[PDB]
Structure 1
Amino acid sequence: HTSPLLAPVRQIHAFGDSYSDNGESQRLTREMLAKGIAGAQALPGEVYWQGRWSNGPTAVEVLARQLGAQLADHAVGGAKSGADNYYGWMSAYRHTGLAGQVDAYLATLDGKPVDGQALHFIFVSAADFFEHEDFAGEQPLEQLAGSSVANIRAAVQRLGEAGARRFLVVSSTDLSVVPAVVAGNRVERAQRYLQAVNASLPIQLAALRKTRGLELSWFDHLTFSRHLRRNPARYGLVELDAPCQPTQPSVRPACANPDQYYFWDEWHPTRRVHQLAGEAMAARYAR
């Protein structure tokens, strides 16, 4: 039996990575390029919609629309769970990881309290895995997952310390079906990492929720994607594996029917999947 819906939401503060970013990586990389920061690149790039790492709004943007909430989206594409980014060259200008987004949010309150009614939305950890795989991190995956979990728990604790009371934390996504992971022959590594994060993180968050009297909702993105991918026609999806917009090894013309595709590029879902995800996340809350 379902439990009572949570109270309505009028303001979201979002923290996370390319699965949430609604323009920050674009703004920050333009700033870095202007300053001549060594190794800077324009992100996300030309085959993306209005600075989102997709062809349309991210899940948290759709969540805000569904709930009748204003969104302050602090998320930065590439953000790790700790202080820094997949893009190592950003650290010279800004710490854009979850920990750095939390520091910047708390430092910019301008003598105002944290809004105890605002939903603090956290969606991070994929970049920890992509960085470890792409640049040969030596940490065993079980230790990398434990660091991801610790970093997310520390973020919730630090936001709660400052006055936050309401959270929605998203699980790891199914990294094991990401086209770049499939192409890297890294399906089993992704499965082991995401299972370690998803078993441990909700245990840690439940303990913290009780200790600090928080309203903290857990969104299991893996259950969500397994249901979509097992029953795609129900959702109007046709292609679950091929990116609509190939970028590796080079950019090729986009598919004609992007709303029938799961993946936009080799790492990121389409606007259609972000829409279903944001509707699914909204299901725990009253409008």
Structure 2
Amino acid sequence: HTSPLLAPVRQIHAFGDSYSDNGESQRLTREMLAKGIAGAQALPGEVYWQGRWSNGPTAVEVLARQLGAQLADHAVGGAKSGADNYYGWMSAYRHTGLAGQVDAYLATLDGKPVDGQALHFIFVSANDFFEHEDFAGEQPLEQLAGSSVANIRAAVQRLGEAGARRFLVVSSTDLSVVPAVVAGNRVERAQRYLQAVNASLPIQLAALRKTRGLELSWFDHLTFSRHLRRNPARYGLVELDAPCQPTQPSVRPACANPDQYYFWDEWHPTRRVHQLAGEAMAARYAR
């Protein structure tokens, strides 16, 4: 039997990576290019919709629309669970990982109170994995997962300490079906990493929830994606594995029917999957 719905939400503060970013990596990289910072590149790029790493709004944007909430989206494409970003060249300019986004949010508050009604949405860890695999991290994956789990738990603790009361923490996504991961022959490594994160993190967050009297909801994005991919026609999906918009090794023409595709590029879901994700996230809350 389902539980009672959670109380309504009128403000979201979102923290995370390219699965949430609604314009920050574009703002920041435009700024860094204006200033000639070393190694700066225009992100996300020309084949993306309005600075999102997709062809439409991210899940958290749809969540906020569903719930009737305003959204302050702090997420930065590339963000890791710690201080920094998949893009190493950002570090000298700004710490845009989850820990840096939390630092910057608390610094903006003047010492002024956290909104105890706002939902603090956290969705990160993919880039921990992508950076480890793309640049030959040597940390065993089990230790990398441990680090991601500790980093997310510390972010919840630090936001809670400052006065946050309501959380929604997204699990790892199914990195094992990401087209870049398939092409790198890294399906088993992604499986092992995401299973470790998703087994450990909810145990840690529930202990924190209880200690600090928080409301903290866990969104299992792996169960979400497995249900969609097992029954694609129910949602109007046709192509689960090919990127609609290939970028590697070069940019090719977008597919004719993007709403029938799971993946936009080699890492990111399409607007359709973000819409279904945001609707699924919204299901635990009253409007």
> Given the two structures, how large is their TM-score scaled by the length of structure 1?
1.00
Instruction: Return the alpha-carbon distance in structure 2 between the equivalents of residues 89 and 32 of structure 1.
Output: 10
Deviation readout 1:187-215 (Å, 9 max, x if unpaired): 00000000000000000000000000000
Instruction: Return the alpha-carbon distance in structure 1 between the equivalents of residues 55 and 251 of structure 2.
Output: 15
Instruction: Return the alpha-carbon distance in structure 1 between the equivalents of residues 68 and 7 of structure 2.
Output: 12
Deviation readout 1:45-87 (Å, 9 max, x if unpaired): 0000000000000000000000000000000000000000000
Deviation readout 1:101-148 (Å, 9 max, x if unpaired): 000000001342100000000000000000000000010000000000
Deviation readout 1:153-172 (Å, 9 max, x if unpaired): 00000000000000000000
Secondary structure of 1:111's match?
Answer: coil
Instruction: Return the alpha-carbon distance in structure 2 between the equivalents of residues 3 and 129 of structure 1.
Output: 34
State the 1:34 CA deviation.
Answer: 1.0
* Aligned equivalent of 2:220: 220
Q: State the 4+ residue runs in structure 1 displaced beyond 3 angstroms.
A: none
1:129 lines up with 2:129 in the alignment: yes
Instruction: Return the alpha-carbon distance in structure 1 between the equivalents of residues 249 and 231 of structure 2.
Output: 31
Instruction: Return the alpha-carbon distance in structure 1 between the equivalents of residues 39 and 174 of structure 2.
Output: 30
Secondary structure of 1:9's match?
Answer: coil
* Aligned equivalent of 2:256: 256
Q: Which runs of 5+ in 1 are unaligned?
A: none
Secondary structure of 2:60's match?
Answer: helix
State the 1:261 CA deviation.
Answer: 0.2
Secondary structure of 2:218's match?
Answer: strand
Secondary structure of 1:49's match?
Answer: coil
Instruction: Return the alpha-carbon distance in structure 1 between the equivalents of residues 155 and 36 of structure 2.
Output: 31
* Aligned equivalent of 2:65: 65
Instruction: Return the alpha-carbon distance in structure 2 between the equivalents of residues 55 and 110 of structure 1.
Output: 36
Secondary structure of 2:71's match?
Answer: strand
State the 1:35 CA deviation.
Answer: 1.0
Secondary structure of 2:203's match?
Answer: helix
* Aligned equivalent of 1:109: 109
Q: Which moved more, 1:28-37 or 1:176-185?
A: 28-37
* Aligned equivalent of 1:179: 179
Deviation readout 1:8-33 (Å, 9 max, x if unpaired): 00000000000000000000001111
Secondary structure of 1:284's match?
Answer: coil
Q: How many residues align?
A: 287
Instruction: Return the alpha-carbon distance in structure 2 between the equivalents of residues 137 and 32 of structure 1.
Output: 27
Instruction: Return the alpha-carbon distance in structure 2 between the equivalents of residues 171 and 155 of structure 1.
Output: 14
Instruction: Return the alpha-carbon distance in structure 2 between the equivalents of residues 98 and 84 of structure 1.
Output: 8
State the 1:242 CA deviation.
Answer: 0.2
Q: RMSD across aligned C-alpha pairs, in angstroms? A: 0.4
Deviation readout 1:240-277 (Å, 9 max, x if unpaired): 00000000000000001000000000000000000000
> Given the two structures, how large is their TM-score scaled by the length of structure 2?
1.00
Instruction: Return the alpha-carbon distance in structure 2 between the equivalents of residues 197 and 51 of structure 1.
Output: 28
Q: Which runs of 5+ in 2 are unaligned?
A: none
Instruction: Return the alpha-carbon distance in structure 1 between the equivalents of residues 237 and 274 of structure 2.
Output: 13
* Aligned equivalent of 2:190: 190
Secondary structure of 2:72's match?
Answer: strand
Instruction: Return the alpha-carbon distance in structure 2 between the equivalents of residues 3 and 183 of structure 1.
Output: 41
Secondary structure of 2:150's match?
Answer: helix
Instruction: Return the alpha-carbon distance in structure 2 between the equivalents of residues 28 and 82 of structure 1.
Output: 18
Identity of aligned residues (%): 100
Instruction: Return the alpha-carbon distance in structure 2 between the equivalents of residues 285 and 42 of structure 1.
Output: 37
